[PDB]
């Protein structure tokens, strides 16, 4: 018998007031199993789901109540380098950080997490992560499920290794990324979610240190993808197996009208491949033919770049160097980036949005044709990157392996985006 899917509380303003985020040990009552502690935001394991609106200027007030330094970031958020932030905006124990974020991007499922240099893998694993939703006029008008915690749920996936009491424990891997043998969704092992007989929206986010998931429905039906690291696809895409690498987000719609139960499923070997069970209640209450009003146009790349990742920490043969700018781009411009990895892993770029143009010389799958900020690289990919945000030498954007331990080990590069205007 599984436990109910925990629904992170929705944290939004509306009154132009600040969103308070206290990084702290989770309450025992939110901690599994019953001995070791875990972390989160505001007393929870993991954090609340933030919801903001395109056009808002949101005041975030972070407070660090942990015994070590913590820097927090919103992955996929389009803001200037100094607002990201990272090591230059790190919070010492008991200190705070109150940035004002100008939300200007389209609707998307983003996420926030600790990005403390050297401690990212451990801090995210410990529970320093949560979902971040951007809503806009488009998402508000779409005929899709949107009642948060009713027919629209966050699905935060993490693979862990539990101690003798059922509490996730971390052991730094000697090589590569951390891999667990137990799946947790929103902090619970293979939970179920009770839904009515209609469409349900799941916002899938891979918040694991390194594991890449290959998701499918246990009854063989297709997964109807509607987004989108950086937003909606032009129209829904129905796939049999969905890849979800660390840091990727995809929103799917599941039709529970048949009144039957359906589960999403995925050494190294997992104790269970059960991700989330959609348990019908018998209650009664398609999909849209188009999501985005326009399959948005991409610009002409003025330059190309080549990025190489491997089984050894570093990018392009170099470890991350805070003093070194690896790429200098011009804001408002487009570039073609070729990313290669002989050791399969996800790749993330801060301060941009990109469209995958080719995967190993072939077309990318439909679910991968919208705007993104994270990509699974197994061989080579070609990206059409847009630099819509500015950054500065001491507040650069990072591009990195999404394998958390690898990033911690130096698989990070620095991107300077000269401001336009200036």
Residue numbers in the entry: 30 to 295, 312 to 330, 335 to 471
From the paper:
SufI is a water-soluble, periplasmic protein. The sequence of SufI shows that it is a member of the multicopper oxidase superfamily. The overall structure of SufI is very similar to that of CueO and contains three cupredoxin-like domains. Indeed, access to the region of the structure that forms the active site in multicopper oxidases is blocked in SufI by highly conserved residues. Together, these observations suggest that SufI is neither a copper-binding protein nor an enzyme.
The two molecules of each asymmetric unit are essentially the same within experimental error (rmsds over 408 and 406 Cα atoms of 1.1 and 0.9 Å for the orthorhombic and monoclinic crystals, respectively). Of the two data sets, the orthorhombic crystals diffracted to higher resolution (1.9 Å compared to 2.6 Å). The structure of SufI, determined here at a resolution of 1.9 Å by X-ray crystallography, confirms that the protein belongs to the multicopper oxidase family. No electron density was observed for the hexahistidine affinity tag, with the exception of the arginine residue of the affinity tag linker in chain A of the orthorhombic structure. The main areas of difference between the two crystal forms lie between residues 42–47, 55–66 and 326–334. Residues 42–47 are found in a loop that leads into the first domain, while residues 326–334 compose the long linker between domains 2 and 3. The electron density for both of these regions was poor and often missing entirely for the side chains. This suggests that these differences between the two crystal forms arise from flexibility of the molecule in these regions. Residues 55–66 are found in an extended loop in the first domain: a short alpha-helical segment is present in this loop in the orthorhombic form, which is unravelled in the monoclinic form.
